[PDB]
Write a protein that binds this ligand. Structure first.
Ligand SMILES: Nc1ncnc2c1ncn2[C@@H]1O[C@H](COP(=O)(O)OP(=O)(O)CP(=O)(O)O)[C@@H](O)[C@H]1O
Length: 279
């Protein structure tokens, strides 16, 4: 039932599934070996990650996995985003083949290095993620689910933005009864059901907070049900212990009530470049 797309199709006999990397909401991800998936090296086997449906998959899971695949097709290549490598869509189960990150997600990566991480490492991480998001915004893509659990870390410690299941090509009108994680969402997205690049910028501020707390959970002790009201009233998180004033002012700026008053990803890249260049 899935229409052909030769540019992205990859032969099943060149794909060898291996160890499971983890299951989530609507699917499963497994490590695999793909032979010749790098066209400029057709005989090499490269370790990749494959996203597929589970046995208890719903019809919605299938269209979601397809929709996620289609987003990643139009996004483009970049060092700081998990990139689509290919797909097996014909004569069998849907396999979405993406770059493999051996060190898992940033949240767990940071939590397991709690006392090891230097301050500059954290600034580097933040810088890389700002770059991925700058590129992403330049492709007119809003992520809508930016968070530490959705960043993946490679063997060489490159930060890669992942999980494009909620990403959209663009204002955008969010649906009522939202499917966006509340603690990472800008007030516009939550209250006005609108989404812009500046909405991702707010999420990035929460991402910054996660990074400098070495994987802390945002708005600790505050139930999701009460968070809506507090944000209206101007509630914001505290400065993490391991954070300069400069970097804290950056977070607070990403958390400006007025979207146009928040920095752009290009601005954040500029500032983070400067801060990294020192340090
Ligand atoms: N390209 C990749 N390389 C290595 N591990 C990956 C990966 N893609 C996903 N994973 C891992 O497989 C698991 C499933 O992620 P998935 O995105 O499919 O579900 P999910 O989004 O509901 C969990 P989360 O919301 O925290 O990202 C995750 O633990 C993730 O760390």
């Amino acid at each position: 039932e899935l229409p052909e797309d030769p540019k992205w199709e990859f032969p099943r006999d060149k794909l060898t599934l291996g160890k499971p990397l983890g299951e989530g909401a609507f699917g499963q991800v497994v490590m695999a070996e793909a032979v010749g998936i790098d066209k400029d090296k057709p005989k090499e086997a490269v370790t990749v990650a494959v996203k597929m449906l589970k046995d208890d998959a719903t019809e919605k899971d299938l269209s979601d996995l397809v929709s996620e695949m289609e987003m990643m097709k139009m996004i483009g290549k970049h060092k700081n985003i998990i990139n689509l490598l290919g797909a097996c869509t014909q004569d069998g189960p849907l396999y979405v083949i993406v770059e493999y990150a051996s060190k898992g997600n940033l949240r767990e990566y940071l939590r397991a290095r709690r006392p090891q991480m230097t301050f500059k490492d954290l600034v580097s991480c933040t810088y890389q993620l700002a770059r991925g998001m700058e590129y992403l915004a330049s492709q007119k893509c809003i992520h809508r689910d930016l968070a530490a659990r959705n960043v993946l870390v490679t063997e060489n410690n490159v930060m890669k933005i992942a999980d494009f299941g909620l990403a959209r090509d663009i204002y955008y009108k969010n649906t009522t009864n939202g499917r966006l994680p509340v603690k990472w969402m800008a007030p516009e997205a939550l209250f006005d059901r609108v989404y812009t690049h500046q909405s991702d910028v707010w999420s990035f501020g929460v991402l910054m907070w996660e990074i400098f707390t070495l994987g802390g959970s945002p708005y600790p002790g505050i139930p999701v049900e009460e968070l809506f009201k507090l944000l209206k009233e101007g509630h914001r998180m505290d400065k993490p212990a391991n954070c300069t004033n400069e970097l804290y002012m950056m977070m607070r700026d990403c958390w400006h009530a007025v979207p146009s008053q928040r920095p752009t990803f290009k601005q954040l890249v500029e500032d983070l470049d400067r801060i990294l260049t020192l340090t």
